[PDB]
Symmetry: D2
Subunit: 312 residues, 4 copies
């Protein structure tokens, strides 16, 4: 089979709880940029089951599935308490284990799969990464009907998904902020109750009016920047939670007395566990959260994409 690695290799044979998948969709995201041994990339997997190991239960050849790529070894503290995404020595498909940048891919254990019924491989693949990430980020915001949330860059891919999830799972008031009329509009279509265009308005001033000067109870900053970190924490209400997600090389700078006086919290997040995967997939399969705007490409265009869902 073909395989873009960090070639023409052989097709692994599934044994035990393993499952061999015929890749129908291999998502690509900025994380693949940080990657670029040998190792096949592709941590956003979706496809049809080609063959299952003798021990596999509940799945048959032909089944359409999406896969949770981050799998813990089980013995460490994080695996034991149920936070395997924070495993000390994880098995990460497309990162430290061969991924979906190929015609076929092996899933260590069948429990990490999710049978697709409503979505197709292309619509699901991105959910195994951005979906899990965003779903956990909303969970960390600790929202309820009495609260108001601010989603930064609400008109982007991650932003609209965050708005959709928050609207489908919390009942909180949602304020989306972006910088272009188009994005602001995308944020509104995602379900934001209020939208702000930082390019035509002072977001803080607008947020202060919307919340009657209280500020927001949570901010979800997906793919934060030095700019966002210096601006949006100012919008936090007392006890507000600033949920940061991403890997940009920037530092958090905040006056300590402001944190203690207002009991604010800065919380980080990046990926997610089986519970997060189950949640986003149930939502997507129910249509409560729509698939990301996607652009399909060929497997050979992998490098191009990195320079988007690849279809073997």
């Amino acid at each position: 089979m073909r395989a873009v690695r960090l070639q023409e290799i052989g097709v692994p044979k599934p044994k035990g709880p393993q499952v061999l998948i015929k890749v129908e969709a291999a998502g690509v995201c900025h994380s693949d940029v940080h990657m670029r041994l040998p190792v096949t990339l592709g941590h956003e997997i979706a496809g049809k089951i080609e063959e299952v190991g003798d021990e596999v239960v509940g799945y048959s050849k032909g089944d359409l599935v999406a896969v949770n790529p981050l799998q813990g070894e089980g013995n460490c503290y994080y695996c034991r308490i149920g936070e395997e995404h924070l495993c000390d020595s994880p098995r990460w498909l497309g990162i430290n284990f061969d991924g979906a940048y190929a015609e076929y891919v092996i899933v260590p254990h069948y429990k990490y799969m999710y049978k697709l019924r409503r979505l197709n491989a292309v619509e699901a693949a991105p959910l195994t990464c951005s979906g899990i990430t965003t779903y956990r980020a909303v969970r960390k915001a600790s929202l309820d009907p009495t609260k108001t949330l601010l989603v930064v860059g609400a008109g982007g891919g991650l932003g609209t998904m965050a708005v959709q999830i928050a609207k489908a799972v919390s009942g909180a008031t949602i304020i989306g902020v972006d910088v272009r009329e188009e994005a602001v509009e995308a944020a509104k279509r995602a379900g934001a109750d209020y939208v702000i265009n930082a390019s035509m308005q002072d977001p803080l001033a607008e947020i202060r009016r919307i919340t009657e000067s209280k500020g927001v109870d949570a901010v979800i900053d997906l793919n934060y920047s030095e700019k966002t970190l210096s601006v949006y924490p100012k919008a936090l209400a007392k006890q507000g939670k600033y949920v940061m997600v991403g890997l940009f090389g920037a530092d958090l700078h905040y006056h300590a007395p402001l944190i203690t006086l207002s009991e604010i919290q800065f919380v980080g997040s990046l990926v997610g566990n089986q519970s997060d995967f189950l949640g986003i997939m149930r939502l997507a399969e129910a249509g409560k959260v729509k698939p990301m705007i996607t652009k399909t490409m060929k497997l050979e265009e992998a490098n191009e994409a990195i320079d988007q869902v690849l279809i073997p």
Copy 2:
């Protein structure tokens, strides 16, 4: 009655004794704790602009004493009862008051801050529900609990501890530190590591109940923490009275999902690389005071003897300015309590 008040140093005035009406309670002060917060008060910063403070005002937010007279609406308390008081009282209408976090009230009634406090012979408690009847503790032992006790109790709760976790208490040999160690020992089951910089402070942390203690002046603290936790790091850090140094050092001891609980008002900034926060799911959380639930918790622990009173130094009401000076010039080791 006599009363030391902030008029613009504090001045000893001779004002009248308020008469309790309705739910109000008149208390004959037996103990008036003094802490660094009173230094901020005397400096003005932190009050008139934001806290609605209107000079002159009797300071003293750490109250304990005997009930002198009660309002006709007061229920469950009688003259002669010995009580401690929760000084932070919400107005009720704001969001924080509605969700039960009145200490974060938009316009609180704060005894000793924007309402007359205990630096006097008598003090009025707006509503009797803010008191706690003492049975085991005396006024002197209880007064500091209304401030440092509530604060530390809440900080421990924010650490989200459980039997599978390990906590690090920074400056574990100090007043606040030993209190945090004791509370964590009594309410969580977590492994407790105390760190300080002096042999006597380190020993005090041990006596407070710490499972492990570290003298950061002798051993590299981070390396010892890694050894004790077998490279995992700690699940929480409680940094009471944080400094520029502690904030730059201890967050590095955090395990994945670790929570760094900062308490205090020192003029310093938190500086941390964002990718480190997201990769490890760490959290930086602030705390300063506490609500009725926090007060209820610390008083129950103290009354049961599960948490010991702070090392105290009793002084007279007229020595209020002196007590506060000892705090400005950091020459006041030991909780100073005024006995009117």
Copy 3:
């Protein structure tokens, strides 16, 4: 002013002519525009109207303001008031129960903090929320729902049922199964947002649930105005770790085999009213249109006895 009051147990309410209280301090005098009436029934615990006058200590409210009121107010000193669960206060001040209510032209609200400024809703639309809204909002929270769970609402086509369906739909992301006992009630459950619906008087509820949940059962059941029948049937639909939230006051007992409880880690939990946080939540949702007002029937204050005889909203 006019005011229908309970002058004698067993006997009917009497329309007396008492004086209009004068608001002092934090108190607020409301010109009643809507006085809800429910089975729980100067009475009137479902209050909504315009502010007539405010006490000298009132802040944030002015005469003319349209407001809804949380009738259950704690004394503050007891354990429950201290931890923020004042609805379970040991000696509460309950408007319309042990304190004069809204069955009159004017009513005094002990403290302004218990009010909520109406901006989208009118008095009639809001009054019911101060009771059924709070109750249902808290019941949904106790169900501990999330997107991977499924909720069963019993009697989902009724007034409380449709409200519970709407709230669960607007705040949880959970799959919702609604069941009731007559077609009009069933169709109403669908309109309320239930993903699946069932008529228990026409078919066996337990088999359908099994099918829908693919034999897992439901993660939570909210049994509004439970009965001897519901309690003997629906707990059987619970999945492992399922929570059975019972709401109501009917004279019936809960009877369940203990081993079934331990083996599945199920929980039976009761709920009846709610606190300031629940009131804040339901008002926020209603004012935002995320949950619609109850179907109401307006009547006159004089018809109090009549209404109790038979959502009916009295209007002075």
Copy 4:
């Protein structure tokens, strides 16, 4: 090797550990009332014969992929292991798995000289405790630790432990004392039991044979009642009496399998927001918690009586009328 299976003593072969499996040389096999019931097919899909013993502790004889463990290590084992695909396994509640692998129940247990642990992650290296002290913790320890967590205790609350002087009761008292800060009231029916509850750490003890327990509980709690009751091995009597001691919002944590029904007036439940919650076993988090406590000496081992592997049936008989078998 010898092995008492479903009881008969057989002479079967010693399995060979492959992959993540671990072969343990059993040094302690706890026995509890659950084995009375064992001695399940149509349900748990039990394929007879099967070696009992779900309370495992011993030395690692051989490791299969195994990482972090070596031959000679002393370990205790979490016997309840989920298959992974079901809802409960996915959300981290594998003890409630739809099709679990349960050592000593539907998989060969410790009633033998050797036993296979499917995956090494279910073990816990012993440092302070010996095999005999640890074995019971894999069952009663996990169970009681989870029951205490379900009580939702905190320093502002008070807990009542029923039968506080028994094996499970003192365990519950000790765990609650070490992990919550709640005030603890232990109740029992004999002077000696009441005494055991006190030594366990109870702040207050009640001899229900001398004083009316509900009355004493009200006096202690100043008429509020308790915020939680942990009723380990409940009976028809406990369920009819103690729920009356619950304060508003109180949680009645029931644990056990006795054939009794819960009977309570609904209005009482709704008016007080009380909760009846069941529990029986526990997950990896529960195992980690109880073992950390025990290994730190914060919770003491159960009073134990060691016996021979061949006395398995006798041990179970004794229950029908903490015993640990030593191969």
